[PDB]
């Protein structure tokens, strides 16, 4: 079926939970043996969210190459994304090592450091120009260059330096600051505006390594971001945009990381975002 009218048909029939459970039943199951090794317990935020072995990002290190991060490679859309958990106190250096090694231009953050009164990820970037951060375990230096605070999101320019080679690179930090503590946003308008700002920066384009996207677990809000982006790109590329099947695209992405889209409300919000976004594109 088309999307907008499939949408109204699920709303009128109140069957979002049944649609979402079908997705969960059909989703791929692949091994994640490296994630579950005992030496990696303090590298995982949640015991039930792990990268598959076949798609995990490897750190360029001979001691321990593990990080909770996955490469989502979308062949028809010609887009790639790295989805990862919010960094932990003992993985902030690994996180920036990955950004460096994978040649990423942008980092997309969809959570606040504290939500619901608890810590959802480490404070992994510097908050003042004159107070830079040094990650001694991976030999990197990170400096805040500039910050632009808007009503729904903040954009930061950061300098990452590889202290072994003295090479430097500019990294863009795109921080969506207004996702509610509970539920999903009422309107997708600010989320779409944010997606378009990431696109306009070049961070999603083939001349750079894949964008790094995270929330707390790296599957819920993060899944919504890449699902909406890929669906809108396919609607631009194809002769028949009504052929784009958002449930099929989501199942394709779940071949590369488990659990993408965590609730039926996130599934409905993804439909809403793609539907509204397709009208603005034209
Ligand atoms: O002072 C912050 C800092 C500087 C350099 C390297 C690591 C850190 N931490 C680690 C713990 O999590 C917060 C960042």
How many domains are there within the chain?
1
Distances (CA, A) of 189 to 11, 108, 224, 272: 20, 17, 14, 10
Q: Which residues are catalytic?
A: 215
| Residue 277, number of CB atoms within 10 A of its CB | 20
Solved using: X-ray
Give resolution in angstroms.
1.8
Distances (CA, A) of 258 to 41, 124, 251, 254: 18, 25, 10, 5
Instruction: Out of 92, 94, 96, give the residue to mutate to test ligand 1, the one with the largest number of ligand atoms within 8 Å of its CB.
Output: 92
Closest Cα partner for 70 from 208, 223, 192, 172? 223
89 lines ligand 1 (CB under 6 A): yes
The first and second tokens of residue 240, run together, are 């028949």
Ligand 1 centroid distance, CA of 122 (Å): 8
Ligand 1 centroid distance, CA of 258 (Å): 29
Structural domain including 26 reads 1-282
For residue 257, what is the enclosing H or E element?
Answer: none
Q: How many Cα neighbours within 13 Å face the side chain of 84?
A: 29
Closest Cα partner for 93 from 128, 125, 51? 125
Q: Which residues of 196-213 are buried (b: 16+ CB within 10 A; e: fewer)?
A: ebbeebebbeeeebbbbb
CATH at 273: 3.90.190.10
Residue 262 assigned as binding residue: yes
CA distance 107 to 14: 36
Residue 221 assigned as binding residue: yes
Instruction: Out of 133, 137, 139, 158, give the residue to mutate to test ligand 1, the one with the largest number of ligand atoms within 8 Å of its CB.
Output: 133
**Cα three-residue angle 124-125-131, rounded to 5 degrees:** 125
Specify which residues 119 forms β-bridges with: 114
For residue 70, what is the enclosing H or E element?
Answer: strand 66-74
92 lines ligand 1 (CB under 6 A): yes
The per-residue DSSP string of 191-217 comes to: HHHHHHHHHHTTTTSTTSBPEEEESSS
Phi-psi region of 117 (alpha: psi -120 to 50; beta: other; left: phi over 0): left
Sign of torsion over alpha carbons 3, 233, 200, 157 = positive
Closest Cα partner for 197 from 233, 153, 157? 153
């Amino acid at each position: 079926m088309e999307m907008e009218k499939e949408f109204e048909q699920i709303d009128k029939s109140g069957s979002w939970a049944a649609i979402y459970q079908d997705i969960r039943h059909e989703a791929s199951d692949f091994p994640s043996r490296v994630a579950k090794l005992p030496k990696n317990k303090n590298r995982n935020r949640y015991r039930d969210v792990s990268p598959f072995d076949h798609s995990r990002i490897k750190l360029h290190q001979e001691d321990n190459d593990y990080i909770n991060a996955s490469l989502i490679k979308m062949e028809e859309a010609q887009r790639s994304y790295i989805l990862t958990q919010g960094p932990l106190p003992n993985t902030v250096g690994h996180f920036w090592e990955m950004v460096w090694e994978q040649k990423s231009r942008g980092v997309v953050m969809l959570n606040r450091v504290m939500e619901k009164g608890s810590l959802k990820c480490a404070q992994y970037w510097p908050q003042k120009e004159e107070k830079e951060m040094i990650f001694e375990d991976t030999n990197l230096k990170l400096t805040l260059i500039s910050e632009d605070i808007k009503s729904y999101y903040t954009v930061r320019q950061l300098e990452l330096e590889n202290l072994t080679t003295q090479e430097t690179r500019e990294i863009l930090h795109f921080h969506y600051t207004t996702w509610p503590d509970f539920g999903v946003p009422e309107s997708p308008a600010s989320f779409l505006n944010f997606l378009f700002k990431v696109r306009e920066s070049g961070s999603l384009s083939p001349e750079h390594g894949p964008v790094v996207v995270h929330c707390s677990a790296g599957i819920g809000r993060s899944g919504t971001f890449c699902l909406a982006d890929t669906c809108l790109l396919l609607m631009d590329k194809r002769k028949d945009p009504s052929s784009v099947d958002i449930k099929k695209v989501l199942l394709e992405m779940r071949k590369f990381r488990m659990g993408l889209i965590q609730t039926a409300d996130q599934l409905r919000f993804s439909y809403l975002a793609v539907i509204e976004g397709a009208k603005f594109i034209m």
